[PDB]
Design a binder for this molecule. Structure first.
Ligand code: 5JL
Length: 112
């Protein structure tokens, strides 16, 4: 397939995923200055802003590498936060609502 339409599709998909994060709590890296223990067991932080930087740096050339970093946004949050927190429930909801978005986007990609 051709590169430019694939990237235009990942851009749209990333926008749709960000739309599901209505609190915008995954829009930027977790502020280590406010969460000084975050990197103790989170070995690769991830967020939507960095996903955008990776997209435009041509770091996502297939749907799996894009989806892998989205999954990190979710899994890091589930790992760090207790189950009874807003953070944890937000990651569960993002996993649920993001899953449909990714499935449809991958179908569009496989037609290419
Ligand atoms: O998962 C989190 N993501 C962010 S951006 N900030 C923050 N603070 C605590 S505590 N947990 C989290």
């Amino acid at each position: 397939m051709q590169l430019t339409p694939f990237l235009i599709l990942l851009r749209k998909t990333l926008e749709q995923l960000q739309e599901k994060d209505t609190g915008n709590i995954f829009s930027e890296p977790v502020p280590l200055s406010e969460v000084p223990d975050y990197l103790d067991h989170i070995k690769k932080p991830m967020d939507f802003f960095t996903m955008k930087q990776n997209l435009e740096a041509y770091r996502y050339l297939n749907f799996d590498d894009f989806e892998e970093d989205f999954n990190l946004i979710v899994s890091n949050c589930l790992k760090y936060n207790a189950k009874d927190t807003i953070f944890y429930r937000a990651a569960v909801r993002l996993r649920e609502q993001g899953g449909a978005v990714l499935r449809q986007a991958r179908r569009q990609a496989e037609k290419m």
